[PDB]
Design an enzyme around this catalytic site. Structure first.
Site, PDB file in Angstrom:
ATOM      1  N   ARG A   1     -13.018  11.121   4.873  1.00 12.46           N
ATOM      2  CA  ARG A   1     -12.875  12.209   3.611  1.00 12.46           C
ATOM      3  C   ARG A   1     -13.585  13.645   3.863  1.00 12.46           C
ATOM      4  O   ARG A   1     -13.060  14.464   3.270  1.00 12.46           O
ATOM      5  CB  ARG A   1     -13.615  11.413   2.419  1.00 12.46           C
ATOM      6  CG  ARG A   1     -12.815  10.178   2.092  1.00 12.46           C
ATOM      7  CD  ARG A   1     -13.112   9.874   0.622  1.00 12.46           C
ATOM      8  NE  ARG A   1     -12.136   9.061  -0.064  1.00 12.46           N
ATOM      9  CZ  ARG A   1     -12.282   8.519  -1.402  1.00 12.46           C
ATOM     10  NH1 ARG A   1     -13.332   8.506  -1.963  1.00 12.46           N
ATOM     11  NH2 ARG A   1     -11.062   7.770  -1.821  1.00 12.46           N
TER      12      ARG A   1
ATOM     13  N   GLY B   1      -6.890   4.633  -5.231  1.00 10.68           N
ATOM     14  CA  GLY B   1      -6.851   4.482  -6.778  1.00 10.68           C
ATOM     15  C   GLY B   1      -5.922   5.685  -7.086  1.00 10.68           C
ATOM     16  O   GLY B   1      -5.162   5.563  -8.070  1.00 10.68           O
TER      17      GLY B   1
ATOM     18  N   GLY C   1      -7.083   2.454   0.640  1.00  4.03           N
ATOM     19  CA  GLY C   1      -7.611   1.346  -0.034  1.00  4.03           C
ATOM     20  C   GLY C   1      -7.961   0.230   1.114  1.00  4.03           C
ATOM     21  O   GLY C   1      -8.496   0.705   2.288  1.00  4.03           O
TER      22      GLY C   1
ATOM     23  N   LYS D   1      -3.781  -9.853  -6.590  1.00  5.44           N
ATOM     24  CA  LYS D   1      -3.311  -9.978  -7.885  1.00  5.44           C
ATOM     25  C   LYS D   1      -1.911  -9.388  -8.284  1.00  5.44           C
ATOM     26  O   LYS D   1      -1.345  -8.424  -7.375  1.00  5.44           O
ATOM     27  CB  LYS D   1      -4.395  -9.576  -8.979  1.00  5.44           C
ATOM     28  CG  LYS D   1      -5.712 -10.298  -8.924  1.00  5.44           C
TER      29      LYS D   1
HETATM   30  N1  LIG Z   1      -2.452 -14.817   0.922  1.00  9.46           N
HETATM   31  C1  LIG Z   1      -3.588 -14.339   0.348  1.00  9.46           C
HETATM   32  N2  LIG Z   1      -4.537 -15.294  -0.322  1.00  9.46           N
HETATM   33  C2  LIG Z   1      -5.752 -14.735  -0.695  1.00  9.46           C
HETATM   34  N3  LIG Z   1      -6.206 -13.453  -0.507  1.00  9.46           N
HETATM   35  C3  LIG Z   1      -5.384 -12.587   0.092  1.00  9.46           C
HETATM   36  C4  LIG Z   1      -3.950 -12.765   0.580  1.00  9.46           C
HETATM   37  N4  LIG Z   1      -3.453 -11.838   1.128  1.00  9.46           N
HETATM   38  C5  LIG Z   1      -4.189 -10.989   0.808  1.00  9.46           C
HETATM   39  N5  LIG Z   1      -5.494 -11.398   0.107  1.00  9.46           N
HETATM   40  C6  LIG Z   1      -6.532 -10.543  -0.064  1.00  9.46           C
HETATM   41  O1  LIG Z   1      -5.997  -9.646  -1.070  1.00  9.46           O
HETATM   42  C7  LIG Z   1      -7.233  -8.492  -1.251  1.00  9.46           C
HETATM   43  C8  LIG Z   1      -6.370  -7.189  -1.388  1.00  9.46           C
HETATM   44  O2  LIG Z   1      -5.967  -7.468  -2.926  1.00  9.46           O
HETATM   45  P1  LIG Z   1      -5.857  -6.398  -4.144  1.00  9.46           P
HETATM   46  O3  LIG Z   1      -5.167  -5.206  -3.402  1.00  9.46           O
HETATM   47  O4  LIG Z   1      -5.660  -6.711  -5.252  1.00  9.46           O
HETATM   48  O5  LIG Z   1      -7.735  -6.160  -4.153  1.00  9.46           O
HETATM   49  P2  LIG Z   1      -8.490  -5.356  -4.961  1.00  9.46           P
HETATM   50  O6  LIG Z   1      -9.213  -4.426  -4.227  1.00  9.46           O
HETATM   51  O7  LIG Z   1      -7.467  -4.433  -5.955  1.00  9.46           O
HETATM   52  C9  LIG Z   1      -9.370  -6.253  -6.135  1.00  9.46           C
HETATM   53  P3  LIG Z   1      -9.339  -8.081  -5.550  1.00  9.46           P
HETATM   54  O8  LIG Z   1      -9.353  -8.214  -4.319  1.00  9.46           O
HETATM   55  O9  LIG Z   1     -10.763  -8.622  -6.250  1.00  9.46           O
HETATM   56  O10 LIG Z   1      -8.350  -8.557  -6.499  1.00  9.46           O
HETATM   57  C10 LIG Z   1      -7.771  -8.188   0.122  1.00  9.46           C
HETATM   58  O11 LIG Z   1      -9.066  -8.287   0.124  1.00  9.46           O
HETATM   59  C11 LIG Z   1      -7.125  -9.421   1.049  1.00  9.46           C
HETATM   60  O12 LIG Z   1      -8.214 -10.218   1.619  1.00  9.46           O
END
Ligand SMILES: Nc1ncnc2c1ncn2[C@@H]1O[C@H](COP(=O)(O)OP(=O)(O)CP(=O)(O)O)[C@@H](O)[C@H]1O
Ligand SMILES: [Mg+2]
Length: 416
Positions: free
Chosen positions: A38, A396, A373, A215
């Protein structure tokens, strides 16, 4: 997106003080900057100013989320002054504050070619507009105080330049509150926006989007918007399980599941069909008896389903093939999110293979864009940042754009 906005290349900074909002909100471990991408990404704009005979350059940014509370021992931009000094090769004046008389006089008629770095803007509740006090109570900023803060920042220079792409989505004081006759967007802002405009207004075809993560609910609008611009889409990671369950009625064991997102899946497919979008989902997986880097490994397919008590943490070999098939046909790619738990070597193979394919495609003329990210840090631990067309410095922020939203950070820019 700034074709209608004022940019640095159209600004005259000869013998003038420049207030430049930048994004130096880098990650730390205990006292060291684990990642300085950055900081280096803002140098091109800083030099252009200096090389063009600038009286001075005032840089301001935040670090973490102090909630408008002075925390010099936790979120001080001092270490960033040392890091910058070496990257610029020039001396940098660091101030213990970002507003007030002392700072204001320091930025008035300074020695030509002076580089000044201010302290964490978030040490004041006027930046964000809200925060908390020592008592722990949540407080709100006063309109009179906000005006003052914004007024103090405006005295720091003659012209204002914004290069904080990573913060472009925030409508904070330093992003939309500076009152100066000229508000120009930096080169980093011009670069980042030029790539996303390509993948939002006129992309190369076929256009493929790779979306992973965990999610689904917080990704609905991202998918909805992308389903209006892409030709093919890959739904991977934990996200996929929510689709397989509702679409194929496949058993997923203790794998991640989104109840809220499960109710929209059918409406998402219908939109893709109507638009002629091919959606590639995984066909097999690498399972685990529990959520641990040292868990027991197994395998499964969509047809067989995931055994009870087990969960999919990565895609399989057959899925890797299909993914590569899609990558080969693409002429443009946007990638956001891993297709498996890449933090654990035993479950990073699926993301590793896709990166290899993506790297090979770039060398063939394919425009590859990796969103910041979790999918951005990957390339770092793979040293494949110069093996793709562009790696975003804002996760973001780039997400906001992809969703089709307007970043307050650029809209506040001067018109032309
Ligand atoms: N099949 C799977 N089962 C469980 N976790 C998984 C997965 N594939 C990817 N992930 C996890 O998903 C995360 C990325 O998810 P996302 O982009 O939603 O995260 P985020 O940083 O917005 C918040 P959070 O991770 O708490 O949801 C990574 O840390 C990865 O380890
Ligand atoms: Mg999320």
């Amino acid at each position: 997106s700034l074709s209608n906005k004022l940019t640095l290349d159209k600004l005259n900074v000869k013998g003038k003080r420049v207030v430049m909002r930048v994004d130096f909100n880098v990650p730390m471990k205990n006292n060291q900057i684990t990642n300085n991408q950055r900081i280096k990404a803002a140098v091109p704009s800083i030099k252009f100013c200096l090389d063009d005979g600038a009286k001075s350059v005032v840089l301001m940014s935040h670090l973490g989320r102090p909630d408008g509370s002075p925390m010099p021992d936790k979120y001080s931009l001092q270490p960033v002054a040392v890091e910058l000094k070496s990257l610029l090769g020039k001396d940098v004046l660091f101030l213990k504050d970002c507003v007030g008389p002392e700072v204001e006089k320091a930025c008035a008629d300074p020695a030509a070619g002076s580089v000044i770095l201010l302290e964490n803007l978030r040490f004041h509740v006027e930046e964000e507009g809200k925060g908390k006090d020592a008592s722990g109570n949540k407080v709100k900023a006063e309109p009179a105080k906000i005006k003052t803060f914004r007024a103090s920042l405006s005295k720091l220079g003659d012209v204002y330049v914004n290069d904080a792409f990573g913060t472009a989505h925030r409508a904070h004081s330093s992003m939309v509150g500076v009152n100066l006759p000229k508000k120009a967007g930096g080169f980093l802002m011009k670069k980042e926006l030029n790539y996303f405009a390509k993948a939002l207004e006129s992309p190369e075809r076929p256009f493929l989007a790779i979306l992973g993560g965990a999610k689904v609910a917080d990704k609905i609008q991202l998918i909805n918007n992308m389903l209006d611009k892409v030709n093919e889409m890959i739904i991977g990671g934990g996200m996929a399980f929510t689709f397989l369950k509702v679409l194929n009625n496949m058993e997923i064991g203790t794998s991640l599941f989104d109840e809220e997102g499960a109710k929209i899946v059918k409406n998402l497919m219908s939109k893709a069909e109507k638009n002629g979008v091919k959606i590639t989902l995984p066909v097999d997986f690498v399972t685990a008896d529990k959520f641990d880097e040292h868990a027991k490994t197994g395998q499964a397919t969509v047809a067989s389903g995931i055994p009870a008590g087990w969960m999919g943490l990565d895609c399989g070999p057959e899925s890797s093939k299909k993914y590569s098939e899609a990558v080969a046909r693409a002429k443009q790619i946007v990638w956001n999110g891993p297709v498996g738990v890449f933090e654990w070597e035993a479950f990073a193979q699926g993301t590793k293979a896709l990166m290899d394919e993506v790297v090979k495609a770039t060398s063939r003329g394919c425009i590859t864009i990796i969103g910041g990210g979790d999918t951005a840090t990957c390339c770092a631990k793979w040293n494949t940042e110069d093996k793709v067309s562009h790696v975003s410095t804002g996760g973001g922020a780039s997400l906001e754009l992809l969703e089709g939203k307007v970043l307050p950070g650029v809209d506040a820019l001067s018109n032309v």
